[PDB]
Nucleic acid binder design. Structure first.
Ligand SMILES: [Zn+2]
Ligand SMILES: [Zn+2]
Ligand SMILES: [Zn+2]
Length: 88
DNA sequence: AGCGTGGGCGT
DNA sequence: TACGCCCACGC
């Protein structure tokens, strides 16, 4: 409920609860990409986004569709959420 | 459909 | 701070 870390970049009103969350957000302004994929050498701003990117090189799809006669696999949870909502 | 990526909130 | 997971938007 309290977010004292405010971004003072031009025309930005973002506020955050912790210093790292501010630093993470500020990477969208600066374009800094500290993390690099060891397979394709592409650089990314965040490590968690790098992790899911690597699954494009391995084909790993940990999230499976729970419909018995389907069972499509997906790399990220949000891909499975959209798929499950589609079966409706 | 597949995925970059910005944000919420956690350990 | 490191590290991560989920959710959602926009290609
Ligand atoms: Zn900002
Ligand atoms: Zn890569
Ligand atoms: Zn399915």
């Amino acid at each position: 409920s309290e977010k004292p870390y405010q971004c003072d970049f031009k025309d930005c009103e973002r506020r955050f609860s912790r210093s790292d969350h501010l630093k993470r957000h500020q990477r969208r302004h600066t374009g800094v990409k500290p993390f690099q994929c060891k397979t394709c050498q592409r650089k990314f701003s965040r490590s968690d986004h790098l992790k899911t990117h690597t699954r494009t090189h391995t084909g790993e799809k940990p999230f499976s569709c729970r419909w018995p006669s389907c069972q499509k696999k997906f790399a990220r949870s949000d891909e499975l959420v959209r798929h499950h909502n589609m079966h409706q």
